């Protein structure tokens, strides 16, 4: 039995940006955005500021955001987890930061392997994560309900959120 059999994001575990294991069942009952981040992309500022906006405006309704740094796209996240943590803190991030991972290939974190094969997580244009700042919207049961590509600014997700609260 492996990740292909998982039924929910809530089954998974991941190290937070401080190295501590997190059981993602903490997100049971919470609409969640899962995104891969990087600090040195042209759209880093727009993505972080809009994710912060979304969290500020919707956390009280149950929105949670899980940010996974990854260095797989143009080496745009070269820093240590501590450096990334400090970078995010500079944007007043109050959502959840995770330790750096891979999102594609055989060493990808299993949550990312799983999200990519879900009916609403498969890409319109293929499943692989194409660049930094792909976003998955996850319902309160941990089911993937929509995928938004790197070119879709986080505020576009706002249109869909109330459907899942």
């Amino acid at each position: 039995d492996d990740w292909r059999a998982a039924r929910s994001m809530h089954e998974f575990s991941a190290k937070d940006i401080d190295g501590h294991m997190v059981n993602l069942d903490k997100y049971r009952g919470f609409v969640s955005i899962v995104t891969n981040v990087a600090s040195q992309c042209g759209k880093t500022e727009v993505n972080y500021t809009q994710l912060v906006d979304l969290h500020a405006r919707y956390a009280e309704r149950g929105l949670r955001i899980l940010a996974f740094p990854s260095n797989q796209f143009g080496k745009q996240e070269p820093g240590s987890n501590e450096e990334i943590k400090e970078f995010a803190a500079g944007y007043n991030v109050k959502f959840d930061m995770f330790s750096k991972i891979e999102v594609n290939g055989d060493d990808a974190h299993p949550l990312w392997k799983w999200m990519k094969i879900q009916p609403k997580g498969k890409g319109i244009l293929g499943n692989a994560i194409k660049w930094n700042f792909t976003k998955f919207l996850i319902d309160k049961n941990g089911v993937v309900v929509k995928r938004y590509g790197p070119m879709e600014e986080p505020l576009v997700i706002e249109k869909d959120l109330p459907h899942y609260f």
Binding site: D1, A6, E11, K15, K113
Partner: peptide
């Protein structure tokens, strides 16, 4: 059911 960091899954017995 839980999936560990390495991708293995275990459920209630």
């Amino acid at each position: 059911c839980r999936v560990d960091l390495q991708g293995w899954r275990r459920c209630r017995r």
